[PDB]
From a paper:
The plant‐specific transcription factor BRZ‐INSENSITIVE‐LONG 1 (BIL1)/BRASSINAZOLE‐RESISTANT 1 (BZR1) regulates the growth of Arabidopsis thaliana via brassinosteroid signaling, acting as both a gene repressor and activator. Its upregulation requires environmental cues mediated by PHYTOCHROME INTERACTING FACTOR 4 (PIF4), with oxidative modifications via H2O2 enhancing their interaction. However, the nature of the tripartite complex of cis‐elements, BIL1/BZR1, and PIF4 under redox changes remains unclear. Here, we demonstrate that oxidation of the DNA‐binding domain (DBD) of BIL1/BZR1 alters its DNA‐binding ability.
However, single cis‐elements enriched in brassinosteroid‐induced genes do not support binding of either redox form, nor does BIL1/BZR1 DBD heterodimerize with PIF4 DBD on these elements. These findings highlight the complexity of brassinosteroid transcriptional regulation beyond DNA‐binding specificity and redox modifications.
Residue numbers in the entry:
A (entry chain D), B (entry chain C): -347 to 88
Amino acid sequence: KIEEGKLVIWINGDKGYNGLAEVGKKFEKDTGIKVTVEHPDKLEEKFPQVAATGDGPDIIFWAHDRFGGYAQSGLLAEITPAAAFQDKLYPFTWDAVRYNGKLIAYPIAVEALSLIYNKDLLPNPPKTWEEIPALDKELKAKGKSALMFNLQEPYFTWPLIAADGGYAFKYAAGKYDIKDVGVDNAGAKAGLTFLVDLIKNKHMNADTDYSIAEAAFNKGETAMTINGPWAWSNIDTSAVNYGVTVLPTFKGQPSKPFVGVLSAGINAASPNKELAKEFLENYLLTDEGLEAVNKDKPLGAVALKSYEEELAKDPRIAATMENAQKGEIMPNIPQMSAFWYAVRTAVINAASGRQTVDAALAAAQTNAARRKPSWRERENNRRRERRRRAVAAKIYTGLRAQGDYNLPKHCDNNEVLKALCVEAGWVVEEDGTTYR
Amino acid sequence: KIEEGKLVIWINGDKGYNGLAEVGKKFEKDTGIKVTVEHPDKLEEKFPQVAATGDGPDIIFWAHDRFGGYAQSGLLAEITPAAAFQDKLYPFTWDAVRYNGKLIAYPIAVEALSLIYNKDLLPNPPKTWEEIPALDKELKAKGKSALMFNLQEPYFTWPLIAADGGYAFKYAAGKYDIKDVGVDNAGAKAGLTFLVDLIKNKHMNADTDYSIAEAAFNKGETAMTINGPWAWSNIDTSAVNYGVTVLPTFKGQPSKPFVGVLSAGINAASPNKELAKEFLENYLLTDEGLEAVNKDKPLGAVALKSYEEELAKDPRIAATMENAQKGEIMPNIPQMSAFWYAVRTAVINAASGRQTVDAALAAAQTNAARRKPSWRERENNRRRERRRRAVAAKIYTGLRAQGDYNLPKHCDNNEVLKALCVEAGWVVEEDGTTYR
DNA sequence: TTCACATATGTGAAA
DNA sequence: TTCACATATGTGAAA
Ligand SMILES: OC[C@H]1O[C@H](O[C@H]2[C@H](O)[C@@H](O)[C@@H](O)O[C@@H]2CO)[C@H](O)[C@@H](O)[C@@H]1O
Ligand SMILES: OC[C@H]1O[C@H](O[C@H]2[C@H](O)[C@@H](O)[C@@H](O)O[C@@H]2CO)[C@H](O)[C@@H](O)[C@@H]1O
């Protein structure tokens, strides 16, 4: 839980939490507050569950796409940065982190996936997805593979799914339209079918996850991987001479990644809103602080306009942004979570053979906008059925008490119902078939 | 799924999977068989789910406590090492992987928790738990804590619960009595009370999981932790000058850690049982084999006598075996996962204040002893209720078709039953109160 | 041991 | 939307 005068932080385990830890301790020196950094599991999941009850973090670092469902659930404090401060960060970043006309988080870094490749094994990386099967057959003879990446999270497969026209929610007339979902269209189909054919043809494994893919690339057993700027640090410490480049094209179209802005909203229930706002506006959204995080695991193209000038020279970032320009910023709306779960289920079920590609994406397209019943709605149902059983139980209690039927010492209500039926001149068969 | 010609291994994420991989690489070099080592989360829970359908890895590594349940489920191959090979391993480690008279895994190494303390920060570590609150007062004056260890897995707290008399399943007449559980006795209550009192009086934090406790000791913010030999590697790379010593006493009694034998089981569905047996007997369970794993993360006291006589020279292993002597080998019976689930919920509930100690342990006693109904018993129940509903449905089907009851276009069975009641000479109020 | 009503929620109906 | 039987399993009674 939260306690005043302390600072506990939540950020995903693939980010530079230790680098932030370094920043939190210097916040100690200036203002005296102890700041701890914890990298929990499924934090994007645990937060909307625990924050209701007061338990949770002062701050949560996460991509912006989930904050719209959060903010609409009243979990985040509205953000009040000076007009001078907004100018310090790129306007498209503030746009990503704004829901309904209120700024719910601080933009920190812009993230896009890129193709990462081993130059020693592959000095010239492929420009197309279509050439990856042939290239894998070549490298298999040398004891390598062409490409491994996280097939458990749809974030990593969406670029291929979008290339030929697959889309989540079509933005039309100034808004995202949840009636027009494109996870079921011909571009989406072709994208997934190709990914599955790669698996069918033993060029990838359906079980490959984030950890397996990183270890294979970092040890040099795979020539390529798809990942974001956070992964660069571990490749750095490895022995692999790598490059960061544009994603392969599919059917001649670019790979279209979903661009996430790593944001930071504050726990509406925190006793330290401004004692944490010191951190966020005057400590992290600063050049010298972002360096500390970026030094641990790279942040990507940070939203601070002054530090991005230095980082933008890095050819790896230029590539990251080259991919971003070809993709789209994620919507931040509430339906994102249901979209991600539906697409996650569709990829895994098609990758594993559990469902055909058509069946998987068809199921996904209906779930991408499924409404989650409200608490009151669940309580409506719960109470209605409690009433229904209470009425029946009183009927049978009375029948057993005053009926004087010829019943066994112990019997279920069906036997009572049968003895009430015959009394009313019905005959009930053994299996329930009933008639006058 | 397992494939002929390759070996996939599952080992926990805190073990030296990178060292195990190096062993795989030698196997692949002498015999030509590829070996992939993976460390997926919740692997001890994922294996029994996938292996029941013939999926899962070729070899699964875990402490021996979990294998009995795997064997009762027919998920493991029987280990058939020649007598010559069995003799190379300590008899008691073979006992740990014996189930219904058969060997169900290869023992690898003996694991026991120890007290890990920062020599510089805390010379002469405490000999009792009772002096721990006092030692935290002084240490908090220097801005440090006394003790942080994983509070989310009961493994780490069990030594204190068992100290004054808590036990899991009582051994009697040559077998563990699954009905005689000792998680509720006075000794267990005294141990969990002392632990909760540490949190109440602010000497410990209830949310502390493995990574928080590890980062704290390694960074130098706590004078002690409780952990196994796998964690020394990470401590070594840190600045900290650490010692490994006997766990403190509780109420003048030694702490009694549950002793684990890290074990390798062979999936019953693997078409590579001979290859797996060759890899385990002639590559892993060799001096060179265990050394490469051990160098990655220390294994503890290995079961192979030849390499153990070298590892025993290490004072950290002597301590670890000093704690082991005070504890007990874990049972391997299938009921062990139900005992761990119960105690896990108990410690977390008491640590958090969601339950009293007495209430949390009472519920854990009942859960740990709970007789798990068999599939057939589950099926009997399912079928019985299915039959009961079906008979009811027919009775109401017939009543609606032939009743002419003056019922609305659509109405629930309760209303049909009401109509029947009045036809038979009853009155039924709205609320179900029924009398003749 | 078997058994039966209780349980919140699921599937899908009727608007 | 609200509604209602179905769902496997829970709780606990009666041997
Ligand atoms: O896979 C669905 C998932 O995608 C994104 O998660 C990213 C995250 O944005 C990155 O910062 C990094 O942690 O990798 C994640 C994928 O493993 C979305 O942000 C997230 O909401 C969505 O569920
Ligand atoms: O916490 C319950 C847990 O205890 C043991 O797990 C140990 C494991 O033996 C060690 O090798 C190490 O990895 O730490 C684990 C605890 O997090 C039991 O072996 C396990 O079955 C049980 O659930």
